[PDB]
């Protein structure tokens, strides 16, 4: 019941081969989340062998004003990619072969696929000098641009100036190392920056601190804090929290002070999504949103083909914003339309993300409106937040517990 | 549920042949991930006739929700000369006869799929030619297109297979063709191919009887005149006209070559003892079960398929059943059809591979230049090809029974029987 979301009962691969579906220009690989024994009544290995059949599954088509992109689901769960890298690389190459057939020239590795494939390098090992396959990309330079666009939006809608914010970064990984230099070059420098990571990355954080004062030109307070399973209480003194970590529920959403802004690319989210919604509905004292979601100026027509096996035991996709598309997936389409936006493999210099930011703003792209998975923060609640939690009013709220 | 579900599966994973092998996963999907090499040709087929007892679904439900109005790549034939894809159109026999425009449309879509998996030529097997004006209805719709593989009716190759079956049924029966009174039932597409080819490659018979429906009298009269001038036939030529059932005149024939599409026109119980029968008809012009019953009790006839070829080397066949249908066949002998002669392949399907390897063998659309079949016959012989062993659908004639026929109805023994 919408012209921008339509379900297709027949296989998209078959319809393509009979000339009923035009080729795509790019593709994006995803996985089936994590296995839940209450959702499905099969075992994990039975679903991999008999339901997914160890084959890539072309499940979605997104028609944008800048090309078409196919969504292909690998026949694995997220834990299966981490426990066997060789098998994960193998199923990706097969998915790359299918993506090349349907016309894709670039393929994004969405979710935790980079974190499990040496950020794409484990795949380039097996591709060697093969050319018949489309080129892979982690899309993390576009994800970083989407995070910076969300920082800009959550501060604008919150009625808060970034230059008088105390920003805390949880997780300085591939996406994290793209956001921090890009944030300083596109937005006003904050009053304070806090870097937080594992003990293994102390010298790593110590480096970024020194790069912050010389190379990036940050002249504010820089503090270093280390996480042990959970975040140090020091991070709760931050007024804006930027999360880009792979460990889940590291931030206690009930310990953040009233008026905190949270931008989290992490999927899974570094905080409890359900506890954040409940606090926001009762208190309306926080702003939190996805970090890696982009909002296109023009709507996107999404065709959906569910696996008939899983379709029986299933809203979710129809209950979506037709203007929204993930920055990681869209990155493959960007590389296919703009040769200057080269694909990214592994962790490398994050300065080039400024090109992605400029292009995204040139096309009148902005971050997706403030939302977290299924929940969209209502505009009237955001307005109530702006009137109640300006910088001059943060000290005048009771911090529970 | 799982536990037993998996057990069941484990067992039927009998996959027992190095020549025939079942694949539970989609052949199209396995191709797109580089696990299945491209093919050189394809063959289009259909799901036979719908009988409400075989399947438990409605005919419309199966077309819309089981076939999903899409072609189904169901088989791969790996021969020593190329690979062929067997693609099933989402239609039955009547769906092709009742709507030609829709039949052409789904055929176009099948050509599109065949081209993607690498096929350069596509055969129209079964009754598809008779339902698409022998390909002309498809050629008119693909006009001005260069992106699709070329279609062919393959009837020049089926005709070569029929002549090869005539040569084999006479050799195994211990009979000489030059002392046979041959009767042709149906001078259609393949019939107009076998008659000129038979005279140009095998010894001329003593007598020839042309038999068809009434409206084609002067057509039969004209080819009769072509028989005496074009091919130098100096034997007796009689013309009989059939209506509903063959005329008694061809029951006087000792070798019967059927090439008609109307079924049960020849009474197998009226055939004189010692008669040899080759039939391409699909539906067979005779009752198959009555022929098996008479052959098992009396062993006084030889009958076989006409359009089946036998390759000198075995053929590796990959079979992927429709998962919906696979559970309805369950574990009966409908899956014992897996057991088949790995040397056997239909001449119609094999024709598409022949055109992809030999440029002199042009695709055929419409009924034309039947003599040209001689090429098809010559190359096939140079490749050491022969007709399939004497068989009729599921039944293969045992060698001991064929020997009993040759011992009792050989070349010098036919004249010493009751009906001469």
Automatic annotation (TrEMBL), chain B:
It comes from the Bacteria. The chain holds residues 1891 to 2303 of 2303 of the full protein. NADH binds at residues 126, 130, 134, 189-190, 212, 216, 244, 260, 282. NAD(+) binds at residues 126, 130, 134, 189-190, 212, 216, 242, 244, 260-261, 280, 282. Transmembrane segments: none annotated. This is Amino acid adenylation domain protein.
């Amino acid at each position: 019941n919408s012209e921008y979301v339509q379900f297709e009962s027949r296989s998209l691969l078959s319809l393509f081969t009979v000339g009923k579906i035009p080729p795509v220009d790019a593709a994006a690989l995803c996985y089936w989340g994590e296995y839940d024994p209450e959702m499905f009544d099969w075992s994990r290995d039975y679903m991999i062998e008999n339901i997914f059949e160890n084959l890539p599954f072309w499940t979605m088509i997104k028609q944008t004003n800048w090309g078409r992109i196919a969504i292909i689901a690998l026949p694995r769960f997220v834990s299966d990619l981490y426990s066997n890298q060789d098998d994960a690389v193998q199923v990706i190459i097969e998915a790359l072969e299918m993506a090349g057939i349907i016309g894709a020239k670039f393929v994004s590795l969405t979710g935790l696929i980079p974190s499990a494939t040496d950020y794409g390098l484990a795949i380039t090992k097996a591709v060697a000098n093969r050319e018949d396959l489309p080129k892979i990309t982690t899309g993390h330079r576009t994800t970083g641009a989407a995070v910076v666009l969300t920082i800009k939006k959550i501060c604008e809608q919150g009625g808060r100036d970034l230059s008088t914010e105390k920003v805390g970064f949880i997780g300085l990984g591939s996406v994290g190392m793209n956001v921090l230099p890009l944030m300083l070059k596109c937005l006003p420098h904050p009053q304070e920056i806090t870097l937080c990571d594992v003990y293994s990355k102390l010298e790593f954080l110590e480096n970024i601190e020194q790069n912050l004062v010389h190379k990036f030109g940050f002249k504010g307070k820089i503090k270093l804090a280390l996480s042990k399973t959970t975040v140090p209480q020091e991070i709760y003194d931050s007024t804006l929290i930027v999360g880009a970590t792979n460990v889940a529920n590291v931030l206690d959403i009930m310990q953040v002070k009233p008026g905190t802004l949270i931008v989290d690319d992490s999927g899974p989210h570094c905080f409890s999504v359900e506890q954040a919604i409940k606090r926001f509905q009762e208190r309306e004292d926080i702003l939190f949103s996805e970090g890696g979601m982009l909002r296109s100026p023009f709507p996107i027509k999404t065709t959906v083909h569910l696996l008939p096996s899983v379709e029986k035991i299933m809203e979710a996709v129809f209950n979506s914003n037709p203007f929204n598309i993930m920055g990681c997936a869209f990155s493959a389409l960007l590389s296919s339309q703009f040769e200057q936006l080269e694909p990214t493999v592994g962790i490398c210099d994050g300065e080039q993300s400024e090109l992605h930011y400029q292009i995204l703003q040139e096309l009148e792209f902005e971050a997706g409106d403030l939302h977290c998975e299924h929940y969209v923060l209502p505009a009237k609640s955001i307005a109530n937040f702006r009137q109640r939690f300006g910088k001059d009013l943060l000290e005048h709220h009771h911090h529970h517990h």
